[PDB]
Each structure stands twice: as structure tokens, then as C-alpha cells.
């Protein structure tokens, strides 16, 4: 039923998305196994090397 929190590090910024340009699209590399990577959408201002907190790791999203 339940799943744990994961932390992941920003490795590249890819562009801006949403109807008004509101969300940045970004690539992240996990803090446990450094060989893993995924892409995500983020609401606020973002910079390369920021650390995000993920409430689910298994979901992945393209262009909304």
C-alpha cells in the first residue's frame, strides 16, 4: 500500500511547458542509485544541481 519519499538531483533543464509557460521540464538523477535517471515537470524557479523531493518515483511525464 504505502511507499517512501525519494530525493533526486537536477542534471539538465529541457524547456518550459503548460498553457502559459508556467512549468519547467527537467531531467533528474536519484540520490541512492546514481545510474538511474527520469524526466519531470516543476512549478517554481529551478537551477541545475537543485535537489527535489518526490512523493512518487514510479510516475513519469512528457509535455503534460
Amino acid at each position: 500500500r504505502v511507499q517512501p519519499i525519494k530525493l533526486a538531483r537536477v542534471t539538465k533543464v529541457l524547456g518550459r511547458t503548460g498553457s502559459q509557460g508556467q512549468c519547467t521540464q527537467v531531467r533528474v538523477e536519484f540520490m541512492d542509485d546514481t545510474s538511474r535517471s527520469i524526466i519531470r515537470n516543476v512549478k517554481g524557479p529551478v537551477r541545475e544541481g537543485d535537489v527535489l523531493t518526490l512523493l512518487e518515483s514510479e510516475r513519469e511525464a512528457r509535455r503534460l
Binding site: L7, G18, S19, Q22, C23, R40, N41, V42, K43, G44, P45, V46, R47, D50, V51, L52, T53, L54, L55, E56, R59, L64
Partner: protein, 187 residues
């Protein structure tokens, strides 16, 4: 000797930041220790320059807000000063630890963006987490004082103490736990 500055009365060296995502964005210790939460610095001139402002001055700026209070920064320094003196009597703890833990508990970490009544879930960045936390706990202090014999210095102390333990009596914790409930339904 001049390497330690007590902010009038309170030490910075014993403070700890316990979320590794926020250590870069909550400015405390070292070059960020000052005597007063008031400077004339040009923090607005570039995108990430905002992150170099001491966290007690960011609380002081966000407090001089609601129309009749615009520009009145000298009044707003003494509200923060008398709130920290009440926090030390109630808790016995360092007031800077109570502020840092209230910021770490109050910032939301998932939210849902608007696309057409229709929404989609997205991640929140560490700079927007610290921006959201300050606005929520300033709003919580401001709404409680509006028709009570309680001063704003007492309401800002009550709001920070309840947020530092996550009690859900504070305005900031109820609003964080509303935003993450709504976004969890938009996955």
C-alpha cells in the same frame, strides 16, 4: 572576536538545517550573521540573488504588507524582536531553531497546475518551498490578531511554535495539508 555576531542577543552557531534540499536557500550562519534584520541591499536585480538575503530579513520584509502598513520597516523590526523574546520564554530554546523548523515543516512538496476545474500534479522547487512557507505563516499571524486583545507579536510567536512541531492548529500546516491532498487526486 568579530567572527561571532549575536544578532543583539541570540547565537547562530548552534542552529541546524535538517532537510538537505533547503540548506542552499535558508541563509543563516557565517557571512549571513548580522546585528539587525535591516539592510538597503539590491537583492531584486537578478533572478537568484534573492537566496543571499538573511532569513530573518525575508520574514521582516514579508510582514510590512497589508495596505495600511506599506513601507513601515522600523515598526516591523520590533515585531520580530518581541516575537523572538516570547518564543524563548515559552520553549526555553533558541528562537532561530524555531523559525528554521517552522519553515522546514510549512513548505509544500507536491502541487497541481491548472489546465482547463481540471488540474495536473507537478513537483515544487526548493526556492518556491521557502517562498510559500514565509507567506503562509505571515498570513496565519495576520488573520488571528484582527479582532482580539492579543498583539501581533504574541500571534507571530504562537504561529511559529505550532508550525515547528506540525500541530495542525496553525494556518500554515492546514493549508500545506490541503494543497498536497488536492494534488494527490490529480495524478
Amino acid at each position: 572576536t568579530p567572527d561571532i555576531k549575536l544578532f543583539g542577543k541570540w547565537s547562530t552557531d548552534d542552529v541546524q538545517i535538517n532537510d538537505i534540499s533547503l540548506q542552499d536557500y535558508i541563509a543563516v550562519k557565517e557571512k549571513y550573521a548580522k546585528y539587525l534584520p535591516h539592510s538597503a541591499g539590491r537583492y531584486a536585480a537578478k533572478r537568484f540573488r534573492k537566496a543571499q538575503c538573511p532569513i530573518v530579513e525575508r520574514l521582516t520584509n514579508s510582514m510590512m504588507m497589508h495596505g495600511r502598513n506599506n513601507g513601515k520597516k522600523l515598526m516591523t523590526v520590533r515585531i520580530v524582536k518581541h516575537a523572538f523574546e516570547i518564543i524563548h520564554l515559552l520553549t526555553g530554546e533558541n528562537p532561530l531553531q524555531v523559525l528554521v523548523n517552522a519553515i522546514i515543516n510549512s513548505g509544500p512538496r507536491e502541487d497541481s497546475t491548472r489546465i482547463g476545474v481540471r488540474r495536473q500534479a507537478v513537483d515544487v522547487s526548493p526556492l518556491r518551498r521557502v517562498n510559500q512557507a514565509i507567506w503562509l505563516l505571515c498570513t496565519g499571524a495576520r488573520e488571528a490578531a484582527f479582532r482580539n486583545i492579543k498583539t501581533i507579536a504574541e500571534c507571530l510567536a504562537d504561529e511559529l511554535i505550532n508550525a515547528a512541531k506540525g500541530s495542525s492548529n496553525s494556518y500554515a500546516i492546514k493549508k500545506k495539508d490541503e494543497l498536497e491532498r488536492v494534488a494527490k487526486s490529480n495524478r
